[PDB]
Amino acid sequence: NKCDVVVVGGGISGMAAAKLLHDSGLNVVVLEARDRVGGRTYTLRNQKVKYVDLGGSYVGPTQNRILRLAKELGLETYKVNEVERLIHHVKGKSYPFRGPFPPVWNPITYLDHNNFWRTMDDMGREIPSDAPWKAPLAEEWDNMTMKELLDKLCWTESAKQLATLFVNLCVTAETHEVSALWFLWYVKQCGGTTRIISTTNGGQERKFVGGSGQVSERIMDLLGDRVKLERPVIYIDQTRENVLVETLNHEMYEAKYVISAIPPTLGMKIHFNPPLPMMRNQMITRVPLGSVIKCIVYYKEPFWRKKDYCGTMIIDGEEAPVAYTLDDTKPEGNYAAIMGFILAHKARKLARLTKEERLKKLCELYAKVLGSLEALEPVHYEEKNWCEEQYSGGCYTTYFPPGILTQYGRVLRQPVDRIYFAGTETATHWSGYMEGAVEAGERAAREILHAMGKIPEDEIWQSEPESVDVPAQPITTTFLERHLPSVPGLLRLI
Amino acid sequence: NKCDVVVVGGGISGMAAAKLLHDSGLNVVVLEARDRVGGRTYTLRNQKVKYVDLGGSYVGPTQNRILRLAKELGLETYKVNEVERLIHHVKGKSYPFRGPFPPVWNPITYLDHNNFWRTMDDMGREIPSDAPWKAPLAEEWDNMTMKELLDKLCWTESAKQLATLFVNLCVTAETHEVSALWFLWYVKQCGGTTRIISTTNGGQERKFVGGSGQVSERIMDLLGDRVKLERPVIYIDQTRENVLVETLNHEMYEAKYVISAIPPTLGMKIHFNPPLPMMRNQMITRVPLGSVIKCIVYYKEPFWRKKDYCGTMIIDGEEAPVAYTLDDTKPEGNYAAIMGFILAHKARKLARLTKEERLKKLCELYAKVLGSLEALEPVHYEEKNWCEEQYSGGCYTTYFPPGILTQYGRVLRQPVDRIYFAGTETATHWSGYMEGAVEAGERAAREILHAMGKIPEDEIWQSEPESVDVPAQPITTTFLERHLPSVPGLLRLIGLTTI
Numbered sequence A: 001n002k003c004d005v006v007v008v009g010g011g012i013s014g015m016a017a018a019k020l021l022h023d024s025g026l027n028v029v030v031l032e033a034r035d036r037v038g039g040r041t042y043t044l045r046n047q048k049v050k051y052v053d054l055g056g057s058y059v060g061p062t063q064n065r066i067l068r069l070a071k072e073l074g075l076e077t078y079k080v081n082e083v084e085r086l087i088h089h090v091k092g093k094s095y096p097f098r099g100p101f102p103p104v105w106n107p108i109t110y111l112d113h114n115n116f117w118r119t120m121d122d123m124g125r126e127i128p129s130d131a132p133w134k135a136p137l138a139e140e141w142d143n144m145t146m147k148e149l150l151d152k153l154c155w156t157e158s159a160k161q162l163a164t165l166f167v168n169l170c171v172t173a174e175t176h177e178v179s180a181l182w183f184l185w186y187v188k189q190c191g192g193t194t195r196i197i198s199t200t201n202g203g204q205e206r207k208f209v210g211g212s213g214q215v216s217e218r219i220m221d222l223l224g225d226r227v228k229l230e231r232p233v234i235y236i237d238q239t240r241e242n243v244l245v246e247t248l249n250h251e252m253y254e255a256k257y258v259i260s261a262i263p264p265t266l267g268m269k270i271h272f273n274p275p276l277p278m279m280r281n282q283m284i285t286r287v288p289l290g291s292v293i294k295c296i297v298y299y300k301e302p303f304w305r306k307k308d309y310c311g312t313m314i315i316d317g318e319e320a321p322v323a324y325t326l327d328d329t330k331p332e333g334n335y336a337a338i339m340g341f342i343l344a345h346k347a348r349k350l351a352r353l354t355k356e357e358r359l360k361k362l363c364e365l366y367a368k369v370l371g372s373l374e375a376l377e378p379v380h381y382e383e384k385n386w387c388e389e390q391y392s393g394g395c396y397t398t399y400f401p402p403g404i405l406t407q408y409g410r411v412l413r414q415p416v417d418r419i420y421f422a423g424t425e426t427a428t429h430w431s432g433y434m435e436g437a438v439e440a441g442e443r444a445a446r447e448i449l450h451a452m453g454k455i456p457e458d459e460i461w462q463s464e465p466e467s468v469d470v471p472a473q474p475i476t477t478t479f480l481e482r483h484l485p486s487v488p489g490l491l492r493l494i
Numbered sequence B: 001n002k003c004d005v006v007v008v009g010g011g012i013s014g015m016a017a018a019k020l021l022h023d024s025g026l027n028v029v030v031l032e033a034r035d036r037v038g039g040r041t042y043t044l045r046n047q048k049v050k051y052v053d054l055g056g057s058y059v060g061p062t063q064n065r066i067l068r069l070a071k072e073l074g075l076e077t078y079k080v081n082e083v084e085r086l087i088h089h090v091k092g093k094s095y096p097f098r099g100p101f102p103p104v105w106n107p108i109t110y111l112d113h114n115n116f117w118r119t120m121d122d123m124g125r126e127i128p129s130d131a132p133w134k135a136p137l138a139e140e141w142d143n144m145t146m147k148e149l150l151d152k153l154c155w156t157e158s159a160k161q162l163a164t165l166f167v168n169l170c171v172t173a174e175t176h177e178v179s180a181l182w183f184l185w186y187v188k189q190c191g192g193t194t195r196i197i198s199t200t201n202g203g204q205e206r207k208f209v210g211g212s213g214q215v216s217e218r219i220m221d222l223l224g225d226r227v228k229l230e231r232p233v234i235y236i237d238q239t240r241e242n243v244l245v246e247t248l249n250h251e252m253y254e255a256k257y258v259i260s261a262i263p264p265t266l267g268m269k270i271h272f273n274p275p276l277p278m279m280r281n282q283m284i285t286r287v288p289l290g291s292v293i294k295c296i297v298y299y300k301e302p303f304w305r306k307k308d309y310c311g312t313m314i315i316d317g318e319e320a321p322v323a324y325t326l327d328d329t330k331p332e333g334n335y336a337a338i339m340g341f342i343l344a345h346k347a348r349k350l351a352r353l354t355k356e357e358r359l360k361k362l363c364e365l366y367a368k369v370l371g372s373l374e375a376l377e378p379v380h381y382e383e384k385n386w387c388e389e390q391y392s393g394g395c396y397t398t399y400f401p402p403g404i405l406t407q408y409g410r411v412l413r414q415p416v417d418r419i420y421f422a423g424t425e426t427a428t429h430w431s432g433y434m435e436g437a438v439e440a441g442e443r444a445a446r447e448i449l450h451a452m453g454k455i456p457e458d459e460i461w462q463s464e465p466e467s468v469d470v471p472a473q474p475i476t477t478t479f480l481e482r483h484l485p486s487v488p489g490l491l492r493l494i495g496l497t498t499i
């Protein structure tokens, strides 16, 4: 089976790469392991839900590539509900609020919370988006976990508990599991603490009407039989004139170049001839993905709105199975629902239960947090545990344990002879997201066009015009936010 | 191709498992990815060296399973040279010594060093060998790195520097890369700090005459054509009555049971039907192996012995490419040589050089440490960087980063339907070593014999008689070693007295 380029993986990144090469007139083939496209996106349809995203779902301002590609494919977005108040549930009680962060009243606690977010952003400003290993303190920050950084920075338990929730929600991993350098890079490359965590004007702003799975599905529609489902790649041989790619179902493909568009560690499922260079050989064993169950509970009405709650809950404490929720009701106001994530160690702990047992735990939690018996009467339930997936390895994305990013980070996007590397993990802006999958797929495709003499080197990386539909507003701070002292700062001054 | 049991992997563990099963009367096949058996053991033979171990090589007292297996195969051991003095090189200078650790004269520094080793072993005694996640403080210890633990325990930089060399040499990883719970388990399950690090009476005491690769080679000889070389396994299907195992070169094997005798993360190279359970699916992405280049420099004579140095060097400092060496001269006294390890980040950093460039840096280092110009006159050089191996992933063994051993540790040797797990990583005594490979291969084989109804349950785990050729001396302490205070203990005493 001969072609110009074989793309390994039919997620957003693989599809985005294959579309760009196809549009330029090359013959492309996509080899997809699953019986479906979309990868870490997956939209389920049935009569009870109409459609529901069980994988990645949210898009927001500054994510211009995914918004442009989806629009071209005929998709529209709608705004996640944030009309009414958010809730922070702390020590068994609900506190309603508005804004990026829940209010803090104790003056010492206030200084400590303010300093924490401000310091994460100050640190990020020294970390290059395209080369975090070049931060002036790269080794110092990479050799400690986020747990150790929080222990140093947070003088109050209140700030440490909220910081921990923040880490667990952003990267589906425990603070002690991940490098401080890598985590600080991850926040900075999504535009900072406010942008990453916000609904209005942030990464949770919007969802696609009909589901995000439609991105990969609609590219597969364009490409037709160029997409081969149930073709897990098992072997890549670069010792001859053309590259040879073999699948598990005993097919052989021959191409001038390959794009690897799978999570980095899933490169281990492929046997290489000749062997990979030593730094990549070891890198792909050092880069796990996080752990999460995404759970959606359906109700007759969006009853929380009647109490002036929008459906967003930030829920602290070990006993709560879900630490974060958003309203998942359709833009038409029907199929009322709450989406929640079971994060990191809780995904491992609660996976032992039945689906019915998890539904009961969630409904009882939401009844307490929303202060409503209506939460105890679900009409339907859907969930997906991404820890189970052989061809994802987890969700949302790959995290770096201490020491790995500085030692192996340079390897991620370095070509290996005629194999180029896409996948959201290789992006420089919203890596981890659907936005990063588009950036990395289109960049890896343009590296091949450049290697073919079709475009100049300065066209490999390309800027994206801002979406007219989803424009970004500036992120601002107040004089007091910028200048109030930290807790040890107020002590040095006393 | 039909059989009772397919063993995936022909290193020591898979070879020990296959031998046990074969001896019990079962039909076994070994599917080995490489064109050779032995895996993380590899004995090179050529005219310049005669033979030389480029992978695992040392055995010692308390490693009774590997000693028994090797003896039965007709192999002999000899003692690594420790006749003359050891050297500790720190801050640019060499200090000769004898004993498990260089002597410390400053009384405050002495308290801190004594307390450090003592405390590592005290903590280890809280950790069950067969279940480290059951330690009372397992979560607390697993949620910090070894670097954080050294920062807390060591009240002198001298102790922290030495402990850092200790961690790097024991597990070919950095202190900040590894879980404190996992590292404390690893040391305890090798018999403790003295036993793991010693030559005489420890893990470095002996080598096999002719090389350790003979263990795997001689078992292949016993098994004949049951060992299939250049058969990398790509696919295991358990949806039917018999297990189906497919190889890369397009062959199919059918068996009642399978033993996976490969490093845990190399399980990712196999596509599973049905998919693995979620805990194992994630576990095999969380367990990297360490990084090392093993380097042997050959000389006309063992010239260091004439200066009353045995060849053992503990070398501190970033600029030193090699942090630990042993005399590698043949027991006959010829093919004089120094073996050195390039460890952890230095294996990555120095892999960029040529073989000739690395030889030059090693000779220049040895010349300074030994105060000997003769070190600049090598006659031959061999090396192996284990980081480059597709079918090993690194050496010596698998390490666990913070948080992993408590969350996923119980999965490591849990059977998946009809797949059982061997490999040194699943051992409970000298896991990471050739000893642990034998323990795990024989244990997994006996799990299958029990599943077939051939042996009762209490025979799955079996004790090993002590070697009569290499018996173990106990590790002892003195009254003062046991009861002298730590540095903060002493400060507490001072505070109390002066109150």
Ligand SMILES: *Cc1cc2c(cc1C)N[C@]1([C@H](CC=O)c3ccccc3)C(=O)NC(=O)N=C1N2C[C@H](O)[C@H](O)[C@H](O)COP(=O)(O)OP(=O)(O)OC[C@H]1O[C@@H](n2cnc3c(N)ncnc32)[C@H](O)[C@@H]1O
Binding pocket: A008, A009, A010, A011, A012, A013, A014, A031, A032, A033, A034, A036, A037, A038, A039, A040, A041, A054, A055, A056, A057, A058, A059, A170, A171, A203, A204, A231, A232, A233, A234, A261, A262, A263, A266, A269, A270, A292, A293, A294, A386, A391, A392, A394, A395, A396, A397, A422, A423, A424, A425, A432, A433, A434, A435, A437
């Ligand atoms: C799973 C999951 C993902 C995301 C979210 C939630 C879940 C449960 N959430 C999103 C955000 C992540 C933040 O960090 C988010 C969370 C919370 C609030 C706001 C936002 C989300 O809502 N928005 C968003 O943009 N991204 C989210 N999540 C991550 C994205 O889903 C993810 O970034 C992209 O989908 C990744 O795309 P790709 O890089 O294209 O990678 P895959 O989807 O994994 O595709 C790889 C395909 O390759 C196939 N494969 C594997 N191995 C193969 C072999 N050997 N041979 C052939 N094919 C192979 C595999 O099957 C895939 O199809």
Ligand SMILES: *Cc1cc2c(cc1C)N[C@]1([C@H](CC=O)c3ccccc3)C(=O)NC(=O)N=C1N2C[C@H](O)[C@H](O)[C@H](O)COP(=O)(O)OP(=O)(O)OC[C@H]1O[C@@H](n2cnc3c(N)ncnc32)[C@H](O)[C@@H]1O
Binding pocket: B008, B009, B010, B011, B012, B013, B014, B031, B032, B033, B034, B037, B038, B039, B040, B041, B054, B055, B056, B057, B058, B059, B170, B171, B203, B204, B231, B232, B233, B234, B261, B262, B263, B266, B269, B270, B292, B294, B386, B391, B392, B394, B395, B396, B397, B422, B423, B424, B425, B432, B433, B434, B435, B437
């Ligand atoms: C590499 C290396 C290993 C060891 C040492 C040094 C090096 C450079 N040193 C040893 C000590 C380790 C201490 O922690 C030590 C160090 C310093 C001072 C004293 C002692 C040593 O000297 N003694 C010792 O006992 N062990 C050492 N090292 C570790 C051992 O080499 C290792 O423990 C065993 O060899 C492991 O045996 P196995 O569990 O059987 O595992 P492998 O050897 O890796 O065999 C697996 C085989 O599987 C094949 N494979 C892989 N993937 C396959 C697929 N998909 N299909 C089929 N076959 C597959 C692979 O090719 C292997 O042959």
Ligand SMILES: CCCCCCCCCCCC[N+](C)(C)CCCS(=O)(=O)O
Binding pocket: A151, A152, A153, A154, A155, A488
């Ligand atoms: C004359 C009185 C002097 C008292 C000295 C006050 C020091 C008290 C220690 C409290 C530790 C608080 N945390 C946040 C855990 C560590 C801070 C990290 S760091 O100290 O900035 O490194």
Ligand SMILES: CCCCCCCCCCCC[N+](C)(C)CCCS(=O)(=O)O
Binding pocket: B151, B152, B153, B154, B155, B488, B491, B492, B495
């Ligand atoms: C007479 C008492 C006065 C003491 C007051 C001085 C403060 C001492 C701080 C030194 C830190 C030493 N290290 C080893 C880095 C950390 C130890 C961790 S732990 O404190 O033992 O938990």
Ligand SMILES: c1ccc2oc(-c3ncc[nH]3)cc2c1
Binding pocket: A099, A100, A101, A102, A162, A163, A165, A166, A169, A197, A198, A199, A312, A314, A324
């Ligand atoms: C810690 C953990 C979760 C969090 O969610 C927010 C938030 N959501 C929408 C506006 N701010 C802020 C926040 C902080």
Ligand SMILES: c1ccc2oc(-c3ncc[nH]3)cc2c1
Binding pocket: B086, B099, B100, B101, B102, B162, B163, B165, B166, B169, B197, B198, B199, B312, B314, B324
């Ligand atoms: C830290 C690093 C390496 C080391 O080697 C020893 C040792 N070797 C032989 C007897 N003791 C002790 C020791 C401590």
